[PDB]
Design a protein around this ligand. Structure first.
Ligand SMILES: Cc1cc2nc3c(=O)[nH]c(=O)nc-3n(C[C@H](O)[C@H](O)[C@H](O)COP(=O)(O)OP(=O)(O)OC[C@H]3O[C@@H](n4cnc5c(N)ncnc54)[C@H](O)[C@@H]3O)c2cc1C
Ligand SMILES: Cc1cc2nc3c(=O)[nH]c(=O)nc-3n(C[C@H](O)[C@H](O)[C@H](O)COP(=O)(O)OP(=O)(O)OC[C@H]3O[C@@H](n4cnc5c(N)ncnc54)[C@H](O)[C@@H]3O)c2cc1C
Ligand SMILES: Oc1ccc(CNCc2cccs2)cc1
Lengths: 588, 588
């Protein structure tokens, strides 16, 4: 019953006050703790819907059933007079700071989930340490605090995506009446990297400050869990030492893989390097077909580069494959070339990168197709986006006993708990969860509230919406069409779909029938919406609101009875009617 | 119950077949009707939850209980042998064209709702006429088929808005690395208007083609209803004649109002003239405070014009007022001048418009502030945006019986029926309804299904989302905050809000804390979202999807459990936490 909740909370919380709102004796303790700069969690029992039962089990720890009761790391401290006695005797500081370990929580990894978990834990009185270290790339690139998204991920690529998009606005401008001469317009790579890097730098520093003003200790060190409560750390000056913590959170994420071919590590780069590269890549070869590969090929072509993408098999594996093909067809018609069904064999250096003059090198790529024929072409730059992976042998001593799945990711319960009872993992290294930054932040926030504040909310990991930021963006929430058919049978699946054309595209003389959307619906369940898909401008802003409706179990009927906002792209979802089974064309 | 439905359906349907999806006799009649180009509604009894009692109740009209049964305008026509016999003998075409009236449906008004009702009715075999005539403005402006939105509303105004937004792309371009000199670039009004008008012309054409292909009769004539079934039509040649119909749908919309001051009609213009003006307005005074006024002042400013808005009292009366003031503040910080608490007293002409050199005139405007001080200034163009009104005197003879509310709008039941049992009204003139194109369209399609296909679905007019396309856009769904407090009391209303900054605005050096959103919730009803508000870019794309969740009863918890898409603006709705009562700052 309620009893096992209360004991979990009391054993885990660092400082926690069971209080009531209309209690002037409770206010006296809150104010004293606030003046002493003592942060704590608070459980207002008159607001929880079974506070009476809780007030009874409290007596199992404190032998009293009144309010307030203050606890520190599992130990009952006093009622109002006892804490007030400690305070006027100068004994309150040394009691709240009494712990078996150096910290209440050590977070290994200062990325999206790590930093989120750390700040949230500190709010409730947990002495917290956050460790972060950025191991350099093969050519030596390195960056500041924040993790992959901040430094070499979502933030720089979308800013470069946006620089690409601005090229369309210079194309459109004559049709809308602006007199600029588009043919004498060049883009400057290094100017744009400076502005992107400058915003990035403002985020590293913002994070360092945030940690400081939350009383979190930031340690720029490499962590290693040598035992369930012991984390070993290495300085930037090689200096080694050991710190201890009650709870450990692992949040060290992933890094880009390289194919095992001669020349790859020596002569190629990855996305870790692309966002601070000091020279324009030049004629580029992007090898791979994930969203990283397609997004990066996309904005290089838009900034005027000569870009080729080498695809082993298909585009965007695991995504709706009608949509992936539409995405890829847009790119192929708007200046991205593809070497389909082709694979690399080696990279040969012909020219070394010129640091002085700020120029790329020259490379020779040898590959072959699946018919056997040979690929041979020279490129100034070669980017590998062939997947990402964790390296938990650098982080996690095998003797500690954290169970890893077959890819190297951490097996966790639905509350992020590992096979060692005090160790948890969040974000990209949590086996089988969506690898996305908002997921890592919600995971790490919600988990901090459970350990140190007595919350019960779990992170919900299903139907998390995504957006691929290719030249024509692709937004999705829910099942792909092939997955929905394979799960319920083709007779049980109805798909409503339609092309559309942004009103902005009419005067600009753009394509009529490339933008596309569809709803995938289960017949036998009130036409429930299993998955939404849209290819068009601003696809993230379009998709996001519908993720709420879908989390609430939206049906086709719900979409019909809601009225559109006009003129928008997104309103076309409110009047879909052509089914795929009908065979009627979806064009405009 | 069921009995009354079946008799309403049989009485107003034009041609209707009762059928079942398995019956191969019914398939025989469908094929004859198809081959004869006979359009008809079809009800498939085995797909309806009470097809048994319906099939029995059919015998009250036909004296048989079997399927298929074919009816024409209330009269039972036969089973399969009788239909086949009529076809075989050349009698079927005459039977199905038998009517007491010229038309099953006459639509007075060819705009958003009118066109939508007509096309839908035609699909089920209703012989349909739509009338549309555009009374010219005071200076002579006139336009083609489609209504106010297509020709002088949502379509031209968003295109002009979009031209204005393009100016920020060219400001933003230098910071993302593109070379162009923003200073040597200028805008050509007439080039822009040619592109807008070209798209509008292709909409005028598309609609005449759609009516032709649906066998709808289109008469470019002004309609007056003289009796319940008699519509008097007047030619572009002034020829008068009378046509009759079973059902009448009034869908005549509204036109701009003018203040009763000297010189307003002679020398001012309205939005009806703005979108096709052959010269650039020049220095402009917009008189009004509605969305029309603010959206037009907005794009005129972004296109380099010298723009002043003259406001009697407040901005955007009827919208959440905190949101309205953030809208006006933004416009004022970006080049729109405001003359506050001011009203105009007369317009004097200093220059006649120059048709020759294609230039505007010159005008002197006199007015006064609410404290008596005088207003006096020169402008080249004065645009009145002081409301809109219907002119049902020109459509509706007194003696017919159609009740009007005190505004001239038509009083209708929740199924759009007027005080005259066969006359209906949809769109802007339907009293008490949100005056929006998606609304007018949905009402027209749903009503046509009920008249001629046996449908029961009503149009749901509650919580229709909206977007105001000012320089910084404002999307909304549900109640204003002040309305929500007036209705439930302050203690029962919680408001979560935050500022935000688009990632696109970081490198562009745009403002940190100007974009804003809030959720207005009800504490006693599970923290139900009563109103959603967002000021920022793509606010209509942002808001639309959430309208579906609001319709389904979404709470604050529903927003919390959904994960955001990153990086987006709209993802801010998924982690809102600062409340207004807490007094914490909403900046970031
Ligand atoms: C090119 C690219 C684009 C992306 N775009 C998007 C997007 O648009 N939207 C989206 O939602 N997601 C996007 N992602 C994914 C997103 O970046 C990740 O899901 C997210 O960053 C994972 O966060 P995390 O907290 O799990 O780990 P990370 O953010 O990777 O942070 C882990 C941190 O811990 C550090 N660390 C590692 N080992 C140690 C150690 N032993 N000691 C100390 N510190 C250590 C790492 O160096 C790093 O700083 C993108 C990823 C890439 C590569
Ligand atoms: C400047 C402006 C901007 C707008 N922007 C938006 C927007 O962004 N989004 C939105 O949802 N709404 C917008 N609206 C509102 C939208 O235009 C109306 O809600 C919509 O047109 C209502 O459609 P309706 O069918 O009721 O009327 P209308 O579209 O006005 O159609 C009525 C038609 O009937 C004709 N008619 C009138 N009298 C007769 C007669 N006696 N005989 C025959 N024909 C006749 C009229 O000339 C007209 O063609 C805007 C309106 C304006 C003025
Ligand atoms: O809602 C909107 C709809 C279209 C646009 C302009 N289109 C930009 C693009 C051109 C090519 C790919 S994306 C802006 C907002």
């Amino acid at each position: 019953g309620t009893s096992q909740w209360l004991r979990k909370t009391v054993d885990s919380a660092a400082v926690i006050l069971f209080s009531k709102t209309t209690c002037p004796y409770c206010k006296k303790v809150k104010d004293v703790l606030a003046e002493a700069k003592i942060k704590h969690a608070t459980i207002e029992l008159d607001q929880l819907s079974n506070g009476s039962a809780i007030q009874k089990c409290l007596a199992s720890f404190s032998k009293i059933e009144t309010v307030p009761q203050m606890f520190v790391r599992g130990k009952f401290i006093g009622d109002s007079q006892t804490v007030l006695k400690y305070y006027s005797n100068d004994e309150l500081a040394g009691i709240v700071n009494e712990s078996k370990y150096d910290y209440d929580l050590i977070v290994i990894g200062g990325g999206s989930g790590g930093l989120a978990a750390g700040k949230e834990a500190a709010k409730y009185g947990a002495k917290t340490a956050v460790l972060d270290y950025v191991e350099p790339t093969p050519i030596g690139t390195t960056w500041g605090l924040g993790g992959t998204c901040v430094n070499v991920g979502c933030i720089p690529k979308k800013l470069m995506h946006q620089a690409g998009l601005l090229s369309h606005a210079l194309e459109d401008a004559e049709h809308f009446g602006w007199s600029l001469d588009r043919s004498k317009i060049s883009h400057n790579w290094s100017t744009m990297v400076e502005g992107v890097q400058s915003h990035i730098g403002s985020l590293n520093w913002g994070y360092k400050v945030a940690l400081r003003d939350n009383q979190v200790t930031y340690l720029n060190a490499k962590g290693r869990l040598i035992s369930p409560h012991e984390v070993q750390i290495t300085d930037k000056n090689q200096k080694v030492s050991t710190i201890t913590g009650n709870k450990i959170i692992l949040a060290t994420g992933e890094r880009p893989k390289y194919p095992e071919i001669p020349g790859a590590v020596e002569y190629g780069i990855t996305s870790d390097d692309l966002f601070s590269l000091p020279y324009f890549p030049g004629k580029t070869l992007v090898i791979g077909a994930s969203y990283v590969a397609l997004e990066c090929a996309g904005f290089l072509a838009s900034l005027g580069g000569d870009v080729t993408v080498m695809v082993r098999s298909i585009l965007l594996r695991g995504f709706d494959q009608q949509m992936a093909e539409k995405v890829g067809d847009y790119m192929e018609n708007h200046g991205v070339k593809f070497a389909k069904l082709c694979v690399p064999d080696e990279i040969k250096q012909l020219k070394v990168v010129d640091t002085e003059n700020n120029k790329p090198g020259l490379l020779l790529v040898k590959g072959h197709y699946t018919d056997g024929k040979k690929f041979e072409e020279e490129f100034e730059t070669v980017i590998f986006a062939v997947g990402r992976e964790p390296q938990l042998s650098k982080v996690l001593c095998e003797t500690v006993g954290v169970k890893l799945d077959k890819n190297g990711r951490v097996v966790c319960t639905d509350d992020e708990q590992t096979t060692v009872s005090n160790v948890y993992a969040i974000g990209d290294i949590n086996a089988g969860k969506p690898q996305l930054t908002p997921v890592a932040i919600q995971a790490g926030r919600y988990l901090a509230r459970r350990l140190f504040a007595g919350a019960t909310e779990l992170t919900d990991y299903s139907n998390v919406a995504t957006t691929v930021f290719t030249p024509l963006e692709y937004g999705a929430c829910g099942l792909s069409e092939e997955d929905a058919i394979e799960k319920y049978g083709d007779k049980d699946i109805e798909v409503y779909h339609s092309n559309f054309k942004p009103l902005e595209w009419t005067v600009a003389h753009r394509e009529d029938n490339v933008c596309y959307m569809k709803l995938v619906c289960r017949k036998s369940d009130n036409m429930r919406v299993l998955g939404l898909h849209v290819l068009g401008p601003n696809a993230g802003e379009i998709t996001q609101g519908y993720a709420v409706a879908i989390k609430m179990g939206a049906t086709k009927a719900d979409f019909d009875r809601t009225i559109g906002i006009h003129p928008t792209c997104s309103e076309t979802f409110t009047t879909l009617h052509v089914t795929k089974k009908s065979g009627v064309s979806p064009i405009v």
